Amino acid sequence: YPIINFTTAGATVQSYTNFIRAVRGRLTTGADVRHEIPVLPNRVGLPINQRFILVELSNHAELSVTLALDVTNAYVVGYRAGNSAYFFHPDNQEDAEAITHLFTDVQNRYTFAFGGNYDRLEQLAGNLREDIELGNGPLEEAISALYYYSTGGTQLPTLARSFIICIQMISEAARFQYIEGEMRTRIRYNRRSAPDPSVITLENSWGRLSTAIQESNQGAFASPIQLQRRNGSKFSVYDVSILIPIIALMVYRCAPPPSSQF
Ligand SMILES: OC[C@H]1O[C@H](O[C@H]2O[C@H](CO)[C@@H](O)[C@H](O)[C@H]2O)[C@H](O)[C@@H](O)[C@@H]1O
Ligand SMILES: OC[C@H]1O[C@H](O[C@H]2O[C@H](CO)[C@@H](O)[C@H](O)[C@H]2O)[C@H](O)[C@@H](O)[C@@H]1O
């Protein structure tokens, strides 16, 4: 599977930008674009040899871990650190079989009894996303935390917190130029801060936005989607147009209707 590298060591807006751009480049194929927004490969009919991509993360502490991302949703399904690999609890038998194709040479394979969704991870971390700082510092720390898990150096709450950090700074950033921008800003000013409502609501609405855009009538949503601004106030989305600078890719929801141009 394709590998994209990134290190928090001496990270800059440009190096992070290159990283996210490369990740998106391995996620979408260009075969499916709707209203100018790329769609991820459809799970249905997708060959296993094209199912995952790997993100090799390194940090200033000279530690490295490899995250595995599912190309169908850009989400993290597991990771490898040294001679051990850990996978989030699969949703079904097909996915359980699919992950056996990852880190096949690792000496110790483990599947967590818990899933990688935020609800579950927040419960295990003992903190909500709104209370977990993001930025290059948090990522640097998260990489070390993931690395030290197999030896008992990392407690479960810290592990979960670290997953929450990685997922948002990699998966959500790949999904939304807006979130990529949020991380770029944190890097530019070496600031670590929790995601505000605009970030949280986008993360929570990615699936719905993907469906709304794909089911839209020439871009017009059948029903509006409510997002939130930085101050928590409502922002109504009625059309795909307002999302062009915001969402970078979508999960496949339905087949694109015929061109049907006038
Ligand atoms: O801000 C750019 C640097 O970010 C990381 O380092 C910072 O994060 C560390 C862990 O929290 C802090 O100890 C340090 O004080 C922060 O500046 C990265 O590890 C550095 O290599 C980057 O230059
Ligand atoms: O059309 C080619 C094959 O598609 C199936 O297999 C792919 O899609 C599945 C999910 O729908 C994956 O689980 C599988 O690994 C992929 O190869 C279909 O089941 C096969 O009969 C078709 O030949």
Side-chain angles (χ1 to χ4, degrees):
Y1 295 119
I3 299 173
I4 305 83
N5 303 299
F6 179 70
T7 180
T8 51
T12 59
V13 168
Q14 190 63 244
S15 70
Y16 178 72
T17 298
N18 294 342
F19 167 53
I20 298 301
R21 183 176 77 70
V23 172
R24 292 184 185 129
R26 294 292 185 174
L27 287 172
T28 57
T29 66
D32 196 344
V33 178
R34 314 188 202 173
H35 302 97
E36 297 173 56
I37 303 170
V39 183
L40 294 170
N42 182 178
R43 168 194 183 80
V44 179
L46 186 63
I48 188 61
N49 75 309
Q50 294 164 40
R51 183 63 181 284
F52 302 110
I53 62 170
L54 307 173
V55 171
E56 189 64 25
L57 299 177
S58 298
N59 64 9
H60 176 62
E62 272 302 313
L63 295 177
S64 298
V65 298
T66 311
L67 308 182
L69 280 60
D70 190 322
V71 306
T72 62
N73 52 35
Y75 212 78
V76 178
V77 301
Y79 83 103
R80 175 177 183 169
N83 299 305
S84 296
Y86 304 78
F87 301 95
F88 289 122
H89 187 225
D91 292 345
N92 50 59
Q93 292 291 177
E94 295 60 51
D95 291 344
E97 188 289 324
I99 59 171
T100 65
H101 295 260
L102 289 166
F103 313 126
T104 64
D105 63 300
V106 72
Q107 297 291 181
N108 306 283
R109 298 180 74 77
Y110 303 102
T111 294
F112 293 128
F114 55 91
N117 59 85
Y118 295 129
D119 288 355
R120 185 64 177 179
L121 294 182
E122 284 173 344
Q123 295 178 54
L124 299 176
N127 278 298
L128 302 175
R129 276 169 282 161
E130 69 184 12
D131 291 330
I132 295 170
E133 300 178 314
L134 298 178
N136 201 232
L139 189 53
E140 164 80 38
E141 292 162 12
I143 293 169
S144 288
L146 265 60
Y147 182 98
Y148 292 121
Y149 186 65
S150 75
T151 53
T154 304
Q155 302 312 301
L156 181 57
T158 298
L159 180 67
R161 188 189 203 73
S162 296
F163 283 140
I164 289 174
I165 292 165
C166 289
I167 293 171
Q168 292 179 274
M169 297 189 70
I170 299 172
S171 298
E172 303 294 6
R175 291 169 171 180
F176 297 98
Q177 293 98 153
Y178 184 86
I179 295 181
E180 173 196 356
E182 283 293 298
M183 299 310 106
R184 289 190 296 87
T185 296
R186 285 168 171 71
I187 293 173
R188 177 172 294 162
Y189 304 111
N190 185 33
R191 164 68 64 179
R192 53 191 290 153
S193 56
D196 65 35
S198 65
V199 175
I200 298 296
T201 60
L202 282 173
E203 297 173 351
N204 294 335
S205 303
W206 186 67
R208 282 289 181 292
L209 290 169
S210 294
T211 311
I213 293 169
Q214 292 171 51
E215 292 282 6
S216 72
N217 283 296
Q218 310 170 333
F221 286 13
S223 61
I225 290 182
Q226 312 296 166
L227 296 179
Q228 283 175 48
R229 300 181 63 63
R230 296 183 184 289
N231 55 38
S233 63
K234 282 301 190 63
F235 186 91
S236 304
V237 180
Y238 305 99
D239 203 273
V240 61
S241 70
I242 200 69
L243 302 174
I244 300 302
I246 307 302
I247 187 171
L249 46 80
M250 309 175 276
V251 53
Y252 181 104
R253 293 304 202 194
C254 67
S259 302
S260 300
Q261 293 300 301
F262 180 93

PDB file of all heavy atoms in Angstrom, residues 7-12 59-61 135-141 186-187 189-192, ligand 1:
ATOM      1  N   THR A   7       6.506  14.318   9.601  1.00  0.00           N
ATOM      2  CA  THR A   7       7.127  14.397  10.905  1.00  0.00           C
ATOM      3  C   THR A   7       6.771  15.720  11.559  1.00  0.00           C
ATOM      4  O   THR A   7       6.665  16.757  10.896  1.00  0.00           O
ATOM      5  CB  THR A   7       8.657  14.281  10.841  1.00  0.00           C
ATOM      6  OG1 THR A   7       9.179  14.362  12.174  1.00  0.00           O
ATOM      7  CG2 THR A   7       9.252  15.399   9.998  1.00  0.00           C
ATOM      8  N   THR A   8       6.562  15.672  12.866  1.00  0.00           N
ATOM      9  CA  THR A   8       6.241  16.872  13.619  1.00  0.00           C
ATOM     10  C   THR A   8       7.527  17.653  13.876  1.00  0.00           C
ATOM     11  O   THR A   8       7.489  18.839  14.194  1.00  0.00           O
ATOM     12  CB  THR A   8       5.583  16.515  14.964  1.00  0.00           C
ATOM     13  OG1 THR A   8       6.392  15.552  15.653  1.00  0.00           O
ATOM     14  CG2 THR A   8       4.199  15.924  14.736  1.00  0.00           C
ATOM     15  N   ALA A   9       8.666  16.982  13.724  1.00  0.00           N
ATOM     16  CA  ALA A   9       9.961  17.618  13.946  1.00  0.00           C
ATOM     17  C   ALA A   9      10.204  18.734  12.938  1.00  0.00           C
ATOM     18  O   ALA A   9      10.328  18.480  11.743  1.00  0.00           O
ATOM     19  CB  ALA A   9      11.075  16.578  13.850  1.00  0.00           C
ATOM     20  N   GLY A  10      10.270  19.968  13.430  1.00  0.00           N
ATOM     21  CA  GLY A  10      10.492  21.106  12.554  1.00  0.00           C
ATOM     22  C   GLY A  10       9.376  21.319  11.546  1.00  0.00           C
ATOM     23  O   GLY A  10       9.589  21.910  10.489  1.00  0.00           O
ATOM     24  N   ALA A  11       8.175  20.847  11.867  1.00  0.00           N
ATOM     25  CA  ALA A  11       7.050  20.998  10.955  1.00  0.00           C
ATOM     26  C   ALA A  11       6.734  22.463  10.675  1.00  0.00           C
ATOM     27  O   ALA A  11       6.867  23.321  11.548  1.00  0.00           O
ATOM     28  CB  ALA A  11       5.816  20.306  11.522  1.00  0.00           C
ATOM     29  N   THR A  12       6.317  22.732   9.446  1.00  0.00           N
ATOM     30  CA  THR A  12       5.953  24.077   9.024  1.00  0.00           C
ATOM     31  C   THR A  12       4.626  23.999   8.287  1.00  0.00           C
ATOM     32  O   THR A  12       4.139  22.912   7.976  1.00  0.00           O
ATOM     33  CB  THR A  12       6.982  24.666   8.049  1.00  0.00           C
ATOM     34  OG1 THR A  12       7.075  23.820   6.896  1.00  0.00           O
ATOM     35  CG2 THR A  12       8.349  24.788   8.716  1.00  0.00           C
ATOM     36  N   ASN A  59       8.456  11.887  14.907  1.00  0.00           N
ATOM     37  CA  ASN A  59       8.479  13.098  15.714  1.00  0.00           C
ATOM     38  C   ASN A  59       9.890  13.467  16.150  1.00  0.00           C
ATOM     39  O   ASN A  59      10.852  12.752  15.858  1.00  0.00           O
ATOM     40  CB  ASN A  59       7.550  12.971  16.935  1.00  0.00           C
ATOM     41  CG  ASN A  59       7.977  11.885  17.906  1.00  0.00           C
ATOM     42  OD1 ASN A  59       9.059  11.308  17.789  1.00  0.00           O
ATOM     43  ND2 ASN A  59       7.123  11.611  18.885  1.00  0.00           N
ATOM     44  N   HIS A  60      10.010  14.595  16.840  1.00  0.00           N
ATOM     45  CA  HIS A  60      11.308  15.065  17.302  1.00  0.00           C
ATOM     46  C   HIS A  60      11.957  14.094  18.283  1.00  0.00           C
ATOM     47  O   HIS A  60      13.183  14.046  18.394  1.00  0.00           O
ATOM     48  CB  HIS A  60      11.162  16.447  17.938  1.00  0.00           C
ATOM     49  CG  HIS A  60      12.432  16.977  18.531  1.00  0.00           C
ATOM     50  ND1 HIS A  60      13.561  17.224  17.781  1.00  0.00           N
ATOM     51  CD2 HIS A  60      12.751  17.290  19.809  1.00  0.00           C
ATOM     52  CE1 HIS A  60      14.523  17.665  18.572  1.00  0.00           C
ATOM     53  NE2 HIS A  60      14.059  17.714  19.808  1.00  0.00           N
ATOM     54  N   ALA A  61      11.132  13.324  18.988  1.00  0.00           N
ATOM     55  CA  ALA A  61      11.629  12.343  19.947  1.00  0.00           C
ATOM     56  C   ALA A  61      12.221  11.129  19.231  1.00  0.00           C
ATOM     57  O   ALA A  61      12.619  10.153  19.870  1.00  0.00           O
ATOM     58  CB  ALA A  61      10.499  11.904  20.872  1.00  0.00           C
ATOM     59  N   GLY A 135      -2.723  20.479  17.495  1.00  0.00           N
ATOM     60  CA  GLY A 135      -1.597  21.283  17.061  1.00  0.00           C
ATOM     61  C   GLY A 135      -0.382  20.390  16.910  1.00  0.00           C
ATOM     62  O   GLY A 135      -0.465  19.186  17.149  1.00  0.00           O
ATOM     63  N   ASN A 136       0.753  20.966  16.526  1.00  0.00           N
ATOM     64  CA  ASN A 136       1.956  20.164  16.338  1.00  0.00           C
ATOM     65  C   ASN A 136       2.464  19.563  17.651  1.00  0.00           C
ATOM     66  O   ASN A 136       3.001  18.454  17.662  1.00  0.00           O
ATOM     67  CB  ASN A 136       3.053  21.006  15.683  1.00  0.00           C
ATOM     68  CG  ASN A 136       4.117  20.155  15.017  1.00  0.00           C
ATOM     69  OD1 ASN A 136       5.312  20.329  15.265  1.00  0.00           O
ATOM     70  ND2 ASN A 136       3.687  19.232  14.163  1.00  0.00           N
ATOM     71  N   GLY A 137       2.299  20.292  18.753  1.00  0.00           N
ATOM     72  CA  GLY A 137       2.734  19.786  20.044  1.00  0.00           C
ATOM     73  C   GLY A 137       1.918  18.557  20.402  1.00  0.00           C
ATOM     74  O   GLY A 137       2.471  17.513  20.756  1.00  0.00           O
ATOM     75  N   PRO A 138       0.583  18.659  20.337  1.00  0.00           N
ATOM     76  CA  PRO A 138      -0.254  17.503  20.659  1.00  0.00           C
ATOM     77  C   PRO A 138       0.058  16.302  19.760  1.00  0.00           C
ATOM     78  O   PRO A 138       0.056  15.159  20.221  1.00  0.00           O
ATOM     79  CB  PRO A 138      -1.669  18.038  20.454  1.00  0.00           C
ATOM     80  CG  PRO A 138      -1.537  19.456  20.930  1.00  0.00           C
ATOM     81  CD  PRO A 138      -0.225  19.893  20.293  1.00  0.00           C
ATOM     82  N   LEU A 139       0.329  16.556  18.481  1.00  0.00           N
ATOM     83  CA  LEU A 139       0.631  15.464  17.559  1.00  0.00           C
ATOM     84  C   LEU A 139       1.963  14.805  17.913  1.00  0.00           C
ATOM     85  O   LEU A 139       2.084  13.579  17.880  1.00  0.00           O
ATOM     86  CB  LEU A 139       0.643  15.971  16.109  1.00  0.00           C
ATOM     87  CG  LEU A 139       0.744  14.904  15.014  1.00  0.00           C
ATOM     88  CD1 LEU A 139      -0.350  13.856  15.205  1.00  0.00           C
ATOM     89  CD2 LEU A 139       0.617  15.564  13.646  1.00  0.00           C
ATOM     90  N   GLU A 140       2.958  15.624  18.247  1.00  0.00           N
ATOM     91  CA  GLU A 140       4.279  15.139  18.651  1.00  0.00           C
ATOM     92  C   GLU A 140       4.080  14.183  19.829  1.00  0.00           C
ATOM     93  O   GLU A 140       4.614  13.071  19.848  1.00  0.00           O
ATOM     94  CB  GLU A 140       5.146  16.340  19.069  1.00  0.00           C
ATOM     95  CG  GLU A 140       6.410  16.043  19.883  1.00  0.00           C
ATOM     96  CD  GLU A 140       7.587  15.570  19.050  1.00  0.00           C
ATOM     97  OE1 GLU A 140       7.775  16.077  17.926  1.00  0.00           O
ATOM     98  OE2 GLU A 140       8.343  14.704  19.542  1.00  0.00           O
ATOM     99  N   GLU A 141       3.291  14.628  20.803  1.00  0.00           N
ATOM    100  CA  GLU A 141       2.994  13.845  21.998  1.00  0.00           C
ATOM    101  C   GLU A 141       2.203  12.580  21.682  1.00  0.00           C
ATOM    102  O   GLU A 141       2.461  11.518  22.253  1.00  0.00           O
ATOM    103  CB  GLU A 141       2.210  14.709  22.991  1.00  0.00           C
ATOM    104  CG  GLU A 141       3.038  15.841  23.588  1.00  0.00           C
ATOM    105  CD  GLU A 141       2.195  16.945  24.205  1.00  0.00           C
ATOM    106  OE1 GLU A 141       0.975  16.754  24.393  1.00  0.00           O
ATOM    107  OE2 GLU A 141       2.767  18.014  24.508  1.00  0.00           O
ATOM    108  N   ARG A 186      -2.417  26.641  13.518  1.00  0.00           N
ATOM    109  CA  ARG A 186      -1.821  26.240  14.786  1.00  0.00           C
ATOM    110  C   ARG A 186      -0.318  26.033  14.622  1.00  0.00           C
ATOM    111  O   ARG A 186       0.465  26.370  15.506  1.00  0.00           O
ATOM    112  CB  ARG A 186      -2.480  24.958  15.298  1.00  0.00           C
ATOM    113  CG  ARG A 186      -3.872  25.183  15.885  1.00  0.00           C
ATOM    114  CD  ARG A 186      -4.590  23.862  16.110  1.00  0.00           C
ATOM    115  NE  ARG A 186      -5.842  24.011  16.853  1.00  0.00           N
ATOM    116  CZ  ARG A 186      -6.949  24.569  16.375  1.00  0.00           C
ATOM    117  NH1 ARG A 186      -6.984  25.049  15.136  1.00  0.00           N
ATOM    118  NH2 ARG A 186      -8.033  24.637  17.137  1.00  0.00           N
ATOM    119  N   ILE A 187       0.087  25.480  13.485  1.00  0.00           N
ATOM    120  CA  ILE A 187       1.504  25.251  13.237  1.00  0.00           C
ATOM    121  C   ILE A 187       2.234  26.578  13.016  1.00  0.00           C
ATOM    122  O   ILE A 187       3.303  26.813  13.582  1.00  0.00           O
ATOM    123  CB  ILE A 187       1.705  24.338  12.004  1.00  0.00           C
ATOM    124  CG1 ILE A 187       1.179  22.937  12.318  1.00  0.00           C
ATOM    125  CG2 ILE A 187       3.181  24.295  11.614  1.00  0.00           C
ATOM    126  CD1 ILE A 187       1.176  22.003  11.126  1.00  0.00           C
ATOM    127  N   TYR A 189       1.751  29.444  14.178  1.00  0.00           N
ATOM    128  CA  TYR A 189       1.965  30.212  15.401  1.00  0.00           C
ATOM    129  C   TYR A 189       2.334  29.354  16.608  1.00  0.00           C
ATOM    130  O   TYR A 189       2.338  29.840  17.741  1.00  0.00           O
ATOM    131  CB  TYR A 189       0.709  31.031  15.699  1.00  0.00           C
ATOM    132  CG  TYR A 189       0.330  31.922  14.543  1.00  0.00           C
ATOM    133  CD1 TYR A 189      -0.820  31.679  13.794  1.00  0.00           C
ATOM    134  CD2 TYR A 189       1.168  32.964  14.144  1.00  0.00           C
ATOM    135  CE1 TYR A 189      -1.122  32.442  12.670  1.00  0.00           C
ATOM    136  CE2 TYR A 189       0.878  33.731  13.025  1.00  0.00           C
ATOM    137  CZ  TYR A 189      -0.266  33.467  12.288  1.00  0.00           C
ATOM    138  OH  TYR A 189      -0.536  34.213  11.164  1.00  0.00           O
ATOM    139  N   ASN A 190       2.666  28.093  16.353  1.00  0.00           N
ATOM    140  CA  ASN A 190       3.012  27.140  17.402  1.00  0.00           C
ATOM    141  C   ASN A 190       2.035  27.262  18.557  1.00  0.00           C
ATOM    142  O   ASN A 190       2.420  27.414  19.718  1.00  0.00           O
ATOM    143  CB  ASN A 190       4.444  27.345  17.902  1.00  0.00           C
ATOM    144  CG  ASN A 190       4.855  26.291  18.913  1.00  0.00           C
ATOM    145  OD1 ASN A 190       4.426  25.137  18.828  1.00  0.00           O
ATOM    146  ND2 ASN A 190       5.696  26.672  19.866  1.00  0.00           N
ATOM    147  N   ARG A 191       0.758  27.199  18.210  1.00  0.00           N
ATOM    148  CA  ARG A 191      -0.317  27.291  19.178  1.00  0.00           C
ATOM    149  C   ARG A 191      -1.017  25.944  19.261  1.00  0.00           C
ATOM    150  O   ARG A 191      -1.209  25.270  18.249  1.00  0.00           O
ATOM    151  CB  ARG A 191      -1.316  28.365  18.737  1.00  0.00           C
ATOM    152  CG  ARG A 191      -2.671  28.305  19.428  1.00  0.00           C
ATOM    153  CD  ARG A 191      -2.578  28.671  20.898  1.00  0.00           C
ATOM    154  NE  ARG A 191      -2.150  30.055  21.085  1.00  0.00           N
ATOM    155  CZ  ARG A 191      -2.014  30.638  22.272  1.00  0.00           C
ATOM    156  NH1 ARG A 191      -2.272  29.956  23.380  1.00  0.00           N
ATOM    157  NH2 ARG A 191      -1.618  31.903  22.352  1.00  0.00           N
ATOM    158  N   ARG A 192      -1.363  25.536  20.475  1.00  0.00           N
ATOM    159  CA  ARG A 192      -2.089  24.295  20.671  1.00  0.00           C
ATOM    160  C   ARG A 192      -3.396  24.707  21.317  1.00  0.00           C
ATOM    161  O   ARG A 192      -3.414  25.417  22.324  1.00  0.00           O
ATOM    162  CB  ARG A 192      -1.304  23.315  21.556  1.00  0.00           C
ATOM    163  CG  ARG A 192      -0.841  23.852  22.895  1.00  0.00           C
ATOM    164  CD  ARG A 192       0.151  22.879  23.537  1.00  0.00           C
ATOM    165  NE  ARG A 192      -0.473  21.631  23.979  1.00  0.00           N
ATOM    166  CZ  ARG A 192       0.172  20.472  24.085  1.00  0.00           C
ATOM    167  NH1 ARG A 192       1.457  20.397  23.769  1.00  0.00           N
ATOM    168  NH2 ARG A 192      -0.462  19.390  24.521  1.00  0.00           N
TER     169      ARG A 192
HETATM  170  O1  LIG B   1       5.923  24.386  16.907  1.00  0.00           O
HETATM  171  C1  LIG B   1       6.836  23.717  16.069  1.00  0.00           C
HETATM  172  C2  LIG B   1       7.478  22.620  16.864  1.00  0.00           C
HETATM  173  O2  LIG B   1       6.397  21.781  17.362  1.00  0.00           O
HETATM  174  C3  LIG B   1       6.855  20.621  18.175  1.00  0.00           C
HETATM  175  O3  LIG B   1       7.436  21.012  19.379  1.00  0.00           O
HETATM  176  C4  LIG B   1       6.681  21.795  20.310  1.00  0.00           C
HETATM  177  O4  LIG B   1       5.938  20.690  20.967  1.00  0.00           O
HETATM  178  C5  LIG B   1       6.674  20.040  22.038  1.00  0.00           C
HETATM  179  C6  LIG B   1       5.842  18.899  22.630  1.00  0.00           C
HETATM  180  O5  LIG B   1       4.643  19.407  23.167  1.00  0.00           O
HETATM  181  C7  LIG B   1       6.997  21.160  23.129  1.00  0.00           C
HETATM  182  O6  LIG B   1       7.741  20.547  24.165  1.00  0.00           O
HETATM  183  C8  LIG B   1       7.813  22.294  22.469  1.00  0.00           C
HETATM  184  O7  LIG B   1       8.064  23.243  23.451  1.00  0.00           O
HETATM  185  C9  LIG B   1       6.873  22.914  21.344  1.00  0.00           C
HETATM  186  O8  LIG B   1       7.561  23.928  20.714  1.00  0.00           O
HETATM  187  C10 LIG B   1       7.902  19.772  17.399  1.00  0.00           C
HETATM  188  O9  LIG B   1       8.301  18.742  18.236  1.00  0.00           O
HETATM  189  C11 LIG B   1       9.105  20.682  17.028  1.00  0.00           C
HETATM  190  O10 LIG B   1      10.045  19.928  16.342  1.00  0.00           O
HETATM  191  C12 LIG B   1       8.535  21.770  16.086  1.00  0.00           C
HETATM  192  O11 LIG B   1       9.515  22.655  15.673  1.00  0.00           O
END
